């Protein structure tokens, strides 16, 4: 009964299959470098499993979808944290203190009629 | 066997569901293989109109029109079951199609 | 190294340099280079006499360039003018001819603001 969790960031959904192994990222047939070439993203993923422990160990492969690259990175981070909680509950206080288990509700605010954007307004121009 | 298909569509919740699972699910006593109602994603048609009859563009109002879809069940084409299927009549607010 | 004009700006690649011909743009230049055989990534400085003679004949073989093209354009404009058409009338009046808007724009057909 494998450890399967999910994480969502903006509109992206990532399904993880946390699994014992050597330590390796498979992202629909791609490595971590192949999928997220950005170093900031490469830190954002696997920030949680190194925030306390541990550290480069048992590997993961996960399905990606929706959103953009940064949203998928954040969703993968959340999924990894949730999977670690499931597989070993002892370090729950550590990850919760680090703030890696919060879903981070931040959606695109909807456009509003009479405005150019969510908040942007046309030039007022008294007179 | 895997022939008859249902296409319930309606403008409102609380009608299509009951119209399915207490009217079309009267074939379970008749002895028909049913997978139950299967909810299909809801539709949204939107409209945005100017409130005023004249010259006030920045004040508007939105309207939806939803459509709910479910019960794509695969009941067996048994001639005695199809009897009940065609002699049963349902609310007009729910639209039913046979494939 | 002249074709009709100088066409040897200092240290320009050939595809861009050819566009200095009045009558050749990027697409014309690309097909000229492709047809002759000279590669686009080559400076006009390093052009040989035989390369120049190859690309010389092929422009009046097919295309139309400085002088006669400039004559034909003004010939068309003048023909429109004295045929008495609407476009020719607007050419005489110095107004936009392709049905543009003259209430608040057309600052190229008309000069700068005249400030009545």
């Amino acid at each position: 009964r494998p450890i399967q969790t999910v994480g969502r960031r903006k509109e992206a959904v990532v399904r993880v299959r946390l699994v014992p192994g050597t330590g390796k990222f498979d992202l629909n047939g791609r490595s971590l470098e192949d999928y997220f070439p950005n170093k900031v993203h490469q830190q954002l993923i696997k920030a949680p499993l190194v925030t306390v422990d541990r550290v480069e160990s048992f590997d993961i492969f996960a399905h990606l979808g929706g959103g953009g690259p940064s949203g998928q990175a954040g969703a993968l981070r959340l999924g990894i944290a949730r999977a670690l909680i499931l597989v070993s509950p002892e370090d729950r206080p550590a990850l919760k203190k680090a703030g890696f288990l919060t879903r981070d509700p931040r959606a695109t605010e909807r456009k509003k009629y009479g405005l150019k954007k969510a908040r942007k307004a046309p030039q007022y121009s008294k007179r | 066997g895997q022939k008859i298909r249902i296409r319930l569509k309606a403008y409102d919740h609380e009608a299509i569901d009951a119209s399915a699972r207490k009217i079309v699910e009267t074939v379970v006593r008749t002895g028909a293989s049913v997978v139950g109602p299967v909810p299909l994603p809801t539709e949204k048609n939107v409209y945005c109109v100017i409130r005023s009859p004249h010259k006030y563009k920045d004040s508007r109002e939105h309207f939806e029109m939803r459509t709910h879809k479910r019960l794509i069940d695969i009941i067996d084409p048994t001639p005695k079951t199809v009897d009940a299927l065609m002699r049963i009549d349902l609310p007009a607010s729910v639209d039913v199609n046979i494939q | 190294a002249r074709l009709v004009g100088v066409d040897l700006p200092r240290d320009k690649r050939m595809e861009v340099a050819l566009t200095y011909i009045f009558g050749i743009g990027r697409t014309r230049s690309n097909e000229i280079l492709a047809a002759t055989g000279i590669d686009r990534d080559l400076r006009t400085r390093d052009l040989t006499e035989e390369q120049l003679i190859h690309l010389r004949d092929y422009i009046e073989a097919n295309l139309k360039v400085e002088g006669d093209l400039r004559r034909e354009v003004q010939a068309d404009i003048r023909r429109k003018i004295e045929i008495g058409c609407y476009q020719g009338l607007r050419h005489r009046r110095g107004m936009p001819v392709r049905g543009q808007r003259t209430k608040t724009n057309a600052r190229t057909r008309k000069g700068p603001k005249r400030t009545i």
């Binding site: - | 403008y11 409209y47 109002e61 309207f63 | -």
Partner: protein, 60 residues
Amino acid sequence: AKKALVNKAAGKPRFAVRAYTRCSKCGRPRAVYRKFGLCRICLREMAHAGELPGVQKSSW
């Protein structure tokens, strides 16, 4: 609108490209939705009255 124009629109005109839609209720020529055949005004009053099945105010 004028009744002459309403009748003219309802009729079958020469050069079928000339056919245009008017509001089915008030005869407005502008802002007529194809799915209802009503102008935006008549649409608004009918929707508030509840005489248009499936239509309702929209919030999200």
